[PDB]
Design a binder for this molecule. Sequence first.
Ligand code: RES
Ligand code: RES
Ligand code: ZN
Ligand code: ZN
Ligand code: ZN
Ligand code: ZN
Ligand code: ZN
Ligand code: ZN
Ligand code: ZN
Ligand code: ZN
Ligand code: ZN
Ligand code: ZN
Ligand code: ZN
Lengths: 216, 218
Amino acid sequence: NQSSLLAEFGDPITRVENALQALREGRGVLLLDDEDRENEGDIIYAVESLTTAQMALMIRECSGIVCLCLTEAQADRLALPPMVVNNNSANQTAFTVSIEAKHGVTTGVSAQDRVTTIKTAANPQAKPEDLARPGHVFPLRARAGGVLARRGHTEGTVDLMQMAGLQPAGVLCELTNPDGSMAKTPEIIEFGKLHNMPVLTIEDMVQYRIQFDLKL
Amino acid sequence: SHMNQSSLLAEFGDPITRVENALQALREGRGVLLLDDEDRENEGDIIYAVESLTTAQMALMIRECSGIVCLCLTEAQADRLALPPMVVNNNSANQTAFTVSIEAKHGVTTGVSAQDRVTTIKTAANPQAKPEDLARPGHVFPLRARAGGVLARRGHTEGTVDLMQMAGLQPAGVLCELTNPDGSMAKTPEIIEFGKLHNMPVLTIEDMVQYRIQFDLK
Ligand SMILES: O=C(NO)[C@H](O)[C@H](O)COP(=O)(O)O
Ligand SMILES: O=C(NO)[C@H](O)[C@H](O)COP(=O)(O)O
Ligand SMILES: [Zn+2]
Ligand SMILES: [Zn+2]
Ligand SMILES: [Zn+2]
Ligand SMILES: [Zn+2]
Ligand SMILES: [Zn+2]
Ligand SMILES: [Zn+2]
Ligand SMILES: [Zn+2]
Ligand SMILES: [Zn+2]
Ligand SMILES: [Zn+2]
Ligand SMILES: [Zn+2]
Ligand SMILES: [Zn+2]
């Protein structure tokens, strides 16, 4: 039972509030989506405080397909169209064209290079010409309305940033077991305890937003 | 004194021998580690043959490499799958030939597990595959190898397809950059140790070029 396992991280309101405070402190959090959706937990970091060490942990412990969650306005500013005109992926995951920093990286895949690319993209004064395409960082357009419009990790990421009062850009990647299977709730909980990362669910976020009448 | 890369690689044999051992590993369904030019990426990538690809091989790649696992295809196969370049005007440093990303439609869930990526890759590499067998976007990244292989473009992409063809295998391979725990990219000494521990031979693009020159040109 997921709610019973998660109980040690506090009740749902506490789980959200602890996640927001972690992010304000520059720490990562772990976000589980619905059991009947992906049933996956993603590491989430605020771009504002992103470090090479955080990126390195993500690469080593997750899928390695590290995504950059952006608002529609920031993706527009960067001139990042959807990768595909007609998306037919199972979840309609909103991949834009992939990106690299135009300057300041080599092959784009080291922890340092991915952070450079991500900081370059997230710069509120960025220009499209600041980014080469294609690249090794994968931006996602978060849906307007956040988790009340789409219950994906993309929306959970941007909603967490906004709720925490942070700049609305986050990085996201799926926690993966050494044998290649995807982490489920017990493994996610274990990882959170190891790395001082709050664990919460998308339903936690949805209930929180509903209760506190939160338009973002 | 630090010996150069060619000297560190001597324990794998002379350049032609390094290629021959790589071909045989692939025929035996084992992986290889391919280094490109020192003044290019100076990176080593794990390569696996698609035709013997296993979940455990993919899991290793996800754990020990960048996790951005690519599928190297011939232009003919990418065309058969209707996989256009991701970007019309590619201005990436190496002009790496990313197509739009892909996912299998059947036999997978979220597409990112080791098993799921293998399923996608097997689906895509099938010589009778059709465009509709693949959803786009997805979590596997196909690359269009240049006609002529390493004699035309000195990328890991061409290295991968060349090795498959020279080994007499299905002309499609899996490719990912070896990465250190601290997030830096693996360099030659680490690549060599990884190869020895995992029974994967190590070779360079220049080895492959010399091999093709000595074995093909007349
Ligand atoms: O597929 C993914 N990344 O590529 C993950 O699911 C990631 O969390 C983002 O996608 P999502 O918003 O559909 O959950
Ligand atoms: O960038 C990469 N993968 O995304 C790797 O370098 C991979 O080897 C393919 O690129 P390359 O053929 O330019 O070397
Ligand atoms: Zn827009
Ligand atoms: Zn590269
Ligand atoms: Zn997700
Ligand atoms: Zn010989
Ligand atoms: Zn010989
Ligand atoms: Zn011979
Ligand atoms: Zn997903
Ligand atoms: Zn390469
Ligand atoms: Zn050893
Ligand atoms: Zn190992
Ligand atoms: Zn030949």
